[PDB]
């Protein structure tokens with residue numbers, strides 16, 4: 001029965017507790033021990049879908065080619081991805097998952113879907129009017145953190 | 147105009163972005179550079195109020211005496227607090243801020259009040275019924291993270 005301010009405080013405290021040293025909030029049992037940044041895991045997820053290039057990656061992930069390079073290089077060092085050259089265009093460097101990465105990508109993607117479906121399920125317990133309230137609260141609150 | 151699940155995702159993403167390497171969400175301009183854990187800063191805030199003992203501290207902060215010891219020892223190493231012995235009872239080890247700590251405590255406390263007052267202000271833009279909605283949403287969401 002605390003104030004909303006206190007409940008918001010506890011909620012955000014619970015998020016930071018839950019995040020521990022991670023920078024991404026993800027639900028779902030987590031088996032992998034492969035320490036990845038979020039940008040790195042998202043490259044993995046992308047490549048689980050389709051062998052891709054740094055251009056297509058930067059575009060898809062809406063980050064800079066430079067940041068894609070940094071992540072690829074780290075992923076590659078960890079032998080989670082491997083570069084190849086496109087058979088039809090020698091200028092084209094492709095990136096794809098190594099077999100070691102496939103479960104890592106598929107796991108992170110499963111987290112994403114588990115998390116999002118949990119939020120959607122929650123969302124669905126509220127009526128439109130309630131969802132607008134929650135959406136307006138979230139927007140206001142998000143603004144305080146940007 | 148995204149789904150609520152997506153907005154919740156973005157919101158939590160914005161929190162993790164905002165937190166960066168911190169484990170406490172705090173609003174307010176931050177000048178101090180004194181790297182502290184949250185438990186350490188809260189001991190500081192306590193001692194800004196009143197010279198205190200490890201017992202009174204563990205009680206007030208609802209953590210174990212053992213965790214108080216760990217924090218005090220770190221604070222003490224950083225010369226942010228100093229131990230003294232109670233003049234009326236030689237068995238009593240008191241802890242108080244060093245002059246260096248006073249602005250650090252007062253700053254962290256100011257963060258707490260700034261953050262909480264910002265949440266309260268936000269809270270106050272919503273009617274009771276809306277606050278219950280937000281409170282119920284927060285509770286449900288908090289449960290997914292515990």
Ligand SMILES: [Zn+2]
Pocket residue numbers: 029030031032107108111
């Ligand atoms: Zn996992």
Ligand SMILES: [Zn+2]
Pocket residue numbers: 024038041042108112
């Ligand atoms: Zn992710």
Ligand SMILES: [Zn+2]
Pocket residue numbers: 175176177178253254257
């Ligand atoms: Zn500060």
Ligand SMILES: [Zn+2]
Pocket residue numbers: 170184187188254258
């Ligand atoms: Zn604090």
